[PDB]
Amino acid sequence: MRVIFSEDHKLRNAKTELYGGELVPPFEAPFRAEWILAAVKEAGFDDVVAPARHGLETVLKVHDAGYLNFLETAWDRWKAAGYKGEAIATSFPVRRTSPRIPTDIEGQIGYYCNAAETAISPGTWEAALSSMASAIDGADLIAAGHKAAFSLCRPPGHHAGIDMFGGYCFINNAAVAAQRLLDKGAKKIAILDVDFHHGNGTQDIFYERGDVFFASLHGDPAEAFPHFLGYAEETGKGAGAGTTANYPMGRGTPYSVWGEALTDSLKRIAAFGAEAIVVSLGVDTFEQDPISFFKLTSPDYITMGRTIAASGVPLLVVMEGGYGVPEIGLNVANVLKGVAG
Amino acid sequence: MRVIFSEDHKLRNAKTELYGGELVPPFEAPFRAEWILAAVKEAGFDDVVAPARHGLETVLKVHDAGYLNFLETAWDRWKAAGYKGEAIATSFPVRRTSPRIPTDIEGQIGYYCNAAETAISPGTWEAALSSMASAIDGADLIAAGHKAAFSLCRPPGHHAGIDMFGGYCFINNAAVAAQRLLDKGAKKIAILDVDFHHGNGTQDIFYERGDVFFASLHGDPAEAFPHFLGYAEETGKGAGAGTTANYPMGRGTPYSVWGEALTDSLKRIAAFGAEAIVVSLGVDTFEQDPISFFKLTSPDYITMGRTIAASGVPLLVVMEGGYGVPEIGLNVANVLKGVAG
Ligand SMILES: NCCCCCC(=O)NO
Numbered sequence: 001m002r003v004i005f006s007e008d009h010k011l012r013n014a015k016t017e018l019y020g021g022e023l024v025p026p027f028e029a030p031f032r033a034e035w036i037l038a039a040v041k042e043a044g045f046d047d048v049v050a051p052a053r054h055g056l057e058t059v060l061k062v063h064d065a066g067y068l069n070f071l072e073t074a075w076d077r078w079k080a081a082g083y084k085g086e087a088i089a090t091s092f093p094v095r096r097t098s099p100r101i102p103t104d105i106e107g108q109i110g111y112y113c114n115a116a117e118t119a120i121s122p123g124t125w126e127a128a129l130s131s132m133a134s135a136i137d138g139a140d141l142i143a144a145g146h147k148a149a150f151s152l153c154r155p156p157g158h159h160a161g162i163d164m165f166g167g168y169c170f171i172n173n174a175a176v177a178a179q180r181l182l183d184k185g186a187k188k189i190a191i192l193d194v195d196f197h198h199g200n201g202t203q204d205i206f207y208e209r210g211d212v213f214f215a216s217l218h219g220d221p222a223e224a225f226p227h228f229l230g231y232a233e234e235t236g237k238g239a240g241a242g243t244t245a246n247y248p249m250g251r252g253t254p255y256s257v258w259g260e261a262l263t264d265s266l267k268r269i270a271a272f273g274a275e276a277i278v279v280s281l282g283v284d285t286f287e288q289d290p291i292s293f294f295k296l297t298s299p300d301y302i303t304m305g306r307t308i309a310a311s312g313v314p315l316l317v318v319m320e321g322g323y324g325v326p327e328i329g330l331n332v333a334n335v336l337k338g339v340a341g
Numbered sequence: 342m343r344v345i346f347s348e349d350h351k352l353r354n355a356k357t358e359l360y361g362g363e364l365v366p367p368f369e370a371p372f373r374a375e376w377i378l379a380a381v382k383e384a385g386f387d388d389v390v391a392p393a394r395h396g397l398e399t400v401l402k403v404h405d406a407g408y409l410n411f412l413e414t415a416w417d418r419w420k421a422a423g424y425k426g427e428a429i430a431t432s433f434p435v436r437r438t439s440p441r442i443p444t445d446i447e448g449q450i451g452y453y454c455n456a457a458e459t460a461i462s463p464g465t466w467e468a469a470l471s472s473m474a475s476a477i478d479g480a481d482l483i484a485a486g487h488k489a490a491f492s493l494c495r496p497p498g499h500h501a502g503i504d505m506f507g508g509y510c511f512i513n514n515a516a517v518a519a520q521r522l523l524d525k526g527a528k529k530i531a532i533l534d535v536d537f538h539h540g541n542g543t544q545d546i547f548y549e550r551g552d553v554f555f556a557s558l559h560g561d562p563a564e565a566f567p568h569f570l571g572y573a574e575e576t577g578k579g580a581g582a583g584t585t586a587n588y589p590m591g592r593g594t595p596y597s598v599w600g601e602a603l604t605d606s607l608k609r610i611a612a613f614g615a616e617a618i619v620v621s622l623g624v625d626t627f628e629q630d631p632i633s634f635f636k637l638t639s640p641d642y643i644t645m646g647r648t649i650a651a652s653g654v655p656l657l658v659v660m661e662g663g664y665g666v667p668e669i670g671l672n673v674a675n676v677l678k679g680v681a682g
């Protein structure tokens with residue numbers, strides 16, 4: 001299977017992340033892509049190609065235009081305003097606020113942000129576009145008839161909602177890929193989000209859409225980021241009724257339990273009639289992940305990939321989270337081995 | 342006139358504030374109260390007394406109980422969770438989120454926060470209670486028949502809404518004072534917020550209440566904190582229809598313009614029939630204020646106090662913002678001179 005990867009991920013190399021009340025070096029740093037790429041090559045996945053560049057045609061169908069315009073100039077405006085650190089939102093449009101959009105950079109960065117633990121830095125927009133492009137080229141391979149491909153996206157995407165960035169994410173790569181598959185002729189697509197964290201951005205994008213089914217397995221939002229979406233009761237609205245399936249799970253969850261949710265999610269995807277599945281793959285479900293509380297082991301990732309591929313429909317695997325140790329690479333490679341075996 | 346002031350304000354002495362993507366020493370620092378107290382004494386206002394302590398009876402009528410419980414234990418829980426910095430929210434319940442309240446400290450601090458530029462630090466709750474007490478004792482003087490009093494509140498209050506802290510504020514002192522006056526027998530009370538920033542917390546508390554009229558003069562939210570409330574179109578809802586009057590103003594506004602809005606706000610208050618006015622006094626409208634863009638001069642504060650007192654109704658002056666330079670003291674004292682002259 002082909003691996004799509006852009007060296008332009010390195011353009012996002014932020015200096016800071018607000019974590020535990022301190023500004024620390026970010027968990028979502030360029031070494032992650034290095035570790036993952038090396039491991040997938042070691043596992044025999046050496047058909048690695050750069051994505052073609054893409055404009056905004058596909059992404060404008062999943063993200064708000066004002067939001068994308070904001071991201072394109074946010075750094076420049078922040079710097080022009082004279083601030084000394086990276087661009088970090090402080091005020092947010094929370095309960096019982098005006099719906100109006102501010103005009104200045106401080107107001108707008110809050111308007112367009114869901115979490116202050118993500119700084120915008122120089123090169124962020126360009127990096128996000130490259131990561132989007134990897135997702136689009138992966139989707140194009142599936143649309144053209146391949147049964148599997150891996151888009152090594154960085155920065156990740158699944159916390160970026162219609163008009164918000166946060167959780168280390170700016171453009172929702174998986175959502176763009178699903179949209180691309182629809183644009184290339186599919187009528188029904190599923191996104192299966194196996195990252196430890198709820199894909200609240202993805203959920204937001206497709207919540208009222210019946211052409212995409214979204215399933216997520218994740219740490220319970222009562223005790224895990226993103227905190228404000230991901231409950232089991234959220235099943236969709238309007239035309240999207242019945243097309244969100246959330247599987248929140250608790251501390252210490254091992255594969256024997258997590259895999260039962262996976263089985264159920266795949267039943268619901270099959271009942272929906274997905275023509276392909278975009279897998280939002282985070283390996284922060286690993287037992288040594290520094291910010292997460294599930295207990296998957298490295299061999300479990302092989303099982304996971306095999307189970308998802310036994311759906312019998314084409315898969316695009318899109319990289320999300322997984323932190324701290326180079327075994328993030330082994331874990332990703334193991335999912336691919338399960339898909340390919 | 343009596344000045345009510347608690348030395349327990351110093352229990353809030355946070356080390357960090359998120360400003361311009363950096364963690365810097367907070368603007369809202371204990372030395373502010375020292376500067377103000379010294380200046381008011383120098384101006385002849387030396388009848389300074391500590392407040393009696395108060396429990397939660399009055400404050401529970403303006404703030405949510407869950408919110409107050411959260412503030413009680415927030416520091417302890419943050420520290421117990423192992424975080425190394427002060428307690429700063431990251432994830433917020435923004436557009437299209439679940440209304441559910443998380444259970445852990447990370448989730449709850451975001452649920453109960455409107456702005457990440459305010460850290461909770463040890464002593465914050467205790468300090469906030471002392472500041473509330475100064476407002477209550479001031480209100481009790483007005484209720485008993487005095488025509489003016491000054492509550493030297495710190496921390497300030499007007500950004501604290503029904504169930505959220507932010508903007509250096511935790512308990513809405515002015516709202517508690519207004520409630521106290523109602524509880525002591527008033528039927529109609531006004532709050533007049535002359536701090537540079539919109540009193541979004543105060544607005545939130547009284548937006549659907551017809552017993553309190555809220556008027557605020559402030560930097561336009563399109564280009565000023567708090568960014569997401571304070572537009573002129575916001576006039577109230579339900580039982581509070583017609584009882585909010587916002588006067589947003591732009592960069593460089595001097596007294597010749599600001600005073601026209603003051604005149605109009607007082608006309609509105611008189612038509613409402615306020616039995617007393619709680620003045621949320623910030624002196625961050627000063628031409629040297631480091632975080633604000635109005636151009637009031639020190640003499641203008643005398644004019645301001647005299648104009649507000651010419652309403653002919655009792656005043657409780659409640660301290661809010663004003664930063665950076667020891668002249669914040671002169672400016673506050675000048676308002677009191679205008680009231681007393
Ligand atoms: N900064 C707090 C954690 C943000 C979520 C990161 C992630 O891995 N999402 O999938």
Ligand SMILES: NCCCCCC(=O)NO
Nearest residue numbers: 458508536538566662663
């Ligand atoms: N940290 C951003 C500014 C918060 C405004 C504080 C204030 O003076 N409110 O009245």
Ligand SMILES: [K+]
Nearest residue numbers: 193195197217
């Ligand atoms: K997930």
Ligand SMILES: [K+]
Nearest residue numbers: 534536538558
């Ligand atoms: K104001």
Ligand code: NA
Nearest residue numbers: 206209212243
């Ligand atoms: Na949907």
Ligand code: NA
Nearest residue numbers: 547550553584
């Ligand atoms: Na009202």
Ligand SMILES: [Zn+2]
Nearest residue numbers: 145146147148
């Ligand atoms: Zn193929």
Ligand SMILES: [Zn+2]
Nearest residue numbers: 195197282321
């Ligand atoms: Zn994750």
Ligand SMILES: [Zn+2]
Nearest residue numbers: 486487488489
């Ligand atoms: Zn008196």
Ligand SMILES: [Zn+2]
Nearest residue numbers: 536538623662
């Ligand atoms: Zn202010």
